[PDB]
Amino acid sequence: TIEEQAKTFLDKFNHEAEDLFYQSSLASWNYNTNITEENVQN
Numbered sequence: 001t002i003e004e005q006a007k008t009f010l011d012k013f014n015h016e017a018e019d020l021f022y023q024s025s026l027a028s029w030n031y032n033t034n035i036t037e038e039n040v041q042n
Contacts, residue, residue, distance in 0.1 A: 031039040 027042045031042065
């Protein structure tokens with residue numbers, strides 16, 4: 001029972017975490033590709 005809901009929790013976490021980490025990694029790649037203070041803020 002508790003294992004099932006924990007698995008559901010992890011499944012819910014995975015999809016949102018993927019998108020957010022992709023956004024963060026893309027922003028970091030942009031800041032390392034160019035160099036601007038706007039990219040620092042991003």
